[PDB]
Structure 1
């Protein structure tokens, strides 16, 4: 599913991401925009053989099991395919664990390079939340 900007903002808010670990909603929407272009079905292979999945591009090296990333962890205890669902619940629950991991949202390269320090509130402007 390809979310609309405000549709995703509302879904994320409902799932408790607004201000989760101190990150306002705009940060999460911005991260999703640049990581997957709001597409829940996005996948991208990494050079180490792991693959990023879903709207937040969660990595199989540590957070989910895809059966093809030797010596990887499954810290979120879910098959990576669960992260591609039109229902973002799994992605959000796993993202909460990732952002609590110690490096905050810096875990998302696109957030660090394209959202961090920018006017992230603009990502939720105009939305009825």
Structure 2
């Protein structure tokens, strides 16, 4: 599924990301825009053989099992395929575990490089929430 900006803002708010670990909703919408262009089916194969999955491009080295990332972890206790659903539950619940570890939203390269230190609330402005 390819979300609209305000559509994803509403869904992420309903799924409890607004101010999760102190990160305003605009941070999460900005991260999804630059990680996946709001496409839940986005995948990216990394140099190290791990893969990034879904609207927040969550990586198989740590967070999910894809059966092809040897010696990796599955800290979200999910198949990586769960991160590609039109239903953002698995992506949101896994993102909540990720952002609760030491480095917060710095875990997302696109957030660090394209959202952090910017007017992120612009991403939810005009939206009915």
TM-score higher than 0.5 here?
yes
Distance (Å, rounded) in 2 between the aligned partners of 1:74 and 1:119: 33
Task: Note the residue ranges of structure 1 that are not aligned, 5 or more in a row.
Answer: none
Shift of 1:33: 0.1
Superposed CA offset, 1:60-111 (max 9, x none): 0000000000000000000000000000000000000000011000000000
Counterpart mapping for 1:1-129 below 5 A: 1-129=1-129
TM-score, length of structure 2 as denominator length: 1.00
Task: Note the residue ranges of structure 2 that are not aligned, 5 or more in a row.
Answer: none
| Number of matched pairs | 129
Distance (Å, rounded) in 2 between the aligned partners of 1:117 and 1:45: 28
RMSD of aligned residue pairs (Cα, Å): 0.2
Distance (Å, rounded) in 1 between the aligned partners of 2:102 and 2:85: 27
